[PDB]
């Protein structure tokens, strides 16, 4: 173990020694039978969610054999009923830091996996905003593409989603990309994909040169926008980082910081969010979630109508363009409520069955007293503080 | 000691400068202008 504590607990496979437990499996179809119970995800859900990056460090996932989730009536069931019922399915998940926004997003991902939908998850958009991977200006797409990040993201889209579902979609145009496949790079210089013969799976497996990769990304998104046989769920976790970083760390040939919307990824994300890119299915949804690690400013609450527009607020603390885009698409908020005492009881019960609680709590303390004390210490229902009061408060 | 503030409700309805002029209108400065 040579890394720091967070990266160690994230990457040291410390759950190898976690005791197995037979939890019920997440199934929104059978929500009634799992409501207010700790559940595990399916095997398919686990594979897809790991490729999506639904699980993150500092979630205490290593405590348990696999990531698990309390299926909550006021968060999970309520949000998913809105996700199935609402006519315009564009959401921003909000709530206090550590309340469960990312877990709610992963439960939405699992619902999508079991609902036969394609999921494009931009987890942690700081990768394409921090200037730690390459970029180049594309002249056809009047945008700065980021080939390394696009390669990683296209592989994630391929891996996470059901291959049969993704092959069901026939291409609606003809495409010609630079060939970068090592075997036939020389024999064949350009790979060509025809209409009604090659599928979105074929396009999504294309190997092209970095400068052309941006076009591939467009080809993918356009294609998924035109098809009407598969719903598309487009998710962005830590979306707040985008709202409070309007200018990326990249700087153009004149040494000026590049606007986030001048990046292909920024333009893509905000086009999907603003509705400029329309998905033809009608069950397609966009789910955004803010994060507590990012700074707050006026952009988000103004875009949600919570506070009026103060036009003298400096651009650092108020970006009107993002408000314009978030309002153009009728993005509505879902605030994750804090846990009630009964949900705390259920979670602590599951934690007891996982042999995670300290002896000072289980051995010699009354159960009701334990529940009351940890409901108090968690700030009346914050899940992260609940866990930290259980497994990380040795005092 | 005592300080008194008086509040009166009511119906709605330079030494340097006067010397700078004197210096500028002096022969010592007027000759450069």
């Amino acid at each position: 173990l040579y890394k720091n504590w967070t990266n160690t607990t994230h990457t040291a496979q410390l759950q190898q020694t976690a005791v197995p437990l037979a939890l019920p499996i997440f199934n929104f179809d059978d929500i009634s039978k799992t409501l207010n119970k700790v559940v595990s995800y399916s095997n398919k859900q686990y594979k897809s969610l790991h490729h999506l990056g639904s699980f993150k460090k500092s979630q205490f996932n290593e405590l348990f054999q696999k990531p698990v989730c309390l299926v909550r009536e006021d968060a999970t069931n309520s949000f998913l009923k809105k996700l199935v019922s609402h006519p315009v399915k564009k959401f921003i998940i909000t709530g206090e830091p550590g309340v469960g926004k990312t877990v709610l997003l992963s439960q939405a991902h699992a619902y999508a996996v079991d609902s036969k939908q394609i999921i494009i998850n931009i987890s942690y958009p700081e990768l394409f905003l921090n200037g730690r991977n390459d970029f180049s200006y594309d002249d056809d797409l009047k945008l700065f593409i980021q080939p390394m990040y696009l390669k990683k993201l296209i592989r994630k889209i391929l891996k996470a989603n059901d291959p049969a579902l993704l092959k069901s979609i026939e291409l609606s145009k003809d495409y010609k990309f630079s060939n970068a496949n090592p075997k036939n790079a020389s024999v064949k210089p350009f790979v060509t994909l025809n209409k009604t013969k090659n599928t979105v799976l074929d396009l999504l497996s294309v190997m092209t040169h970095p400068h052309n990769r941006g076009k591939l990304m467009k080809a993918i998104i356009d294609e998924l926008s035109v098809q009407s046989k598969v719903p598309i769920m487009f998710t962005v976790d830590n979306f707040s980082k985008v709202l409070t970083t309007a200018y990326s760390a990249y700087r153009n040939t004149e040494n000026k910081q590049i606007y986030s919307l001048d990046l292909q990824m920024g333009k893509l994300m905000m086009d999907i969010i603003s509705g400029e890119t329309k998905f033809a299915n009608g069950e397609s949804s966009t789910i955004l979630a803010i994060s507590g690690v990012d700074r707050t400013n006026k952009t988000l609450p103004v875009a949600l109508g919570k506070i009026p527009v103060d036009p003298y607020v400096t651009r650092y603390h108020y970006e009107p363009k993002f408000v314009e885009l978030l309002q153009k698409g009728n993005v509505t908020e879902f605030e994750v409520p804090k846990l009630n005492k009964q949900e705390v009881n259920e979670l602590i019960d599951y934690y007891k069955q996982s042999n995670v609680l300290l002896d000072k709590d289980i051995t010699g303390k009354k159960w009701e007293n334990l529940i009351d004390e940890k409901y108090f210490l968690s700030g009346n229902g914050n899940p992260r503080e609940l866990l930290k009061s259980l497994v990380l408060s040795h005092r | 000691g005592m300080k008194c503030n008086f509040f009166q409700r009511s119906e709605i309805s330079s030494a340097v400068g006067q010397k700078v002029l004197e210096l500028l209108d002096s022969p010592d400065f007027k000759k450069h202008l």
Binding site: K3, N4, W5, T9, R395 | -
Partner: protein
């Protein structure tokens, strides 16, 4: 007095008052702390104990207490007469040995080094047992002068 509050008082007649803090953990964290940065010391200790739990899957506080009780020497020769040690002094000696062992490891983070040192001690692998044995041997050799 009302009957409900008389019943409450009767119920609490038997219950012992809960402890404000764990004295041993308080001592250890205060030994980690410098410059009054207590929260940082508590974070280091709790993170190390979290690693200990995750690798042994037992109550890490109990493991730490067993480790300190076993590793610390019961007596020590001082200027040359053996003298008995109280619990706090024993914990100081044992903790210093543990920290010295942990700072021979590779991780940049002190919490990781300390946690895996405490895991190794909880599994009976520590060089400070030799230090304890040497101290005990000197005390036996000088028992005549007590």
């Amino acid at each position: 007095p009302t009957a409900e509050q008389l019943a409450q008082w009767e119920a609490l007649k038997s219950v012992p008052i809960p402890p404000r803090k764990n004295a041993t953990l308080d001592h250890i964290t205060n030994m980690i702390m410098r410059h009054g940065k207590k929260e940082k010391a508590q974070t280091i200790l709790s993170r190390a104990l979290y690693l200990v739990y995750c690798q042994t899957r037992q109550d890490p506080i109990q493991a730490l207490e067993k480790s300190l009780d076993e590793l610390a020497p019961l007596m020590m020769t001082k200027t040359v007469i053996p003298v008995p040690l109280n619990k706090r002094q024993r914990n100081r000696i044992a903790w210093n040995w543990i920290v010295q062992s942990a700072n021979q490891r590779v991780s940049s983070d002190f919490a990781v080094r300390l946690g895996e040192e405490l895991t190794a001690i909880a599994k009976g692998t520590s060089s400070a047992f030799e230090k304890r044995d040497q101290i005990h041997k000197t005390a036996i050799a000088h028992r005549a002068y007590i």
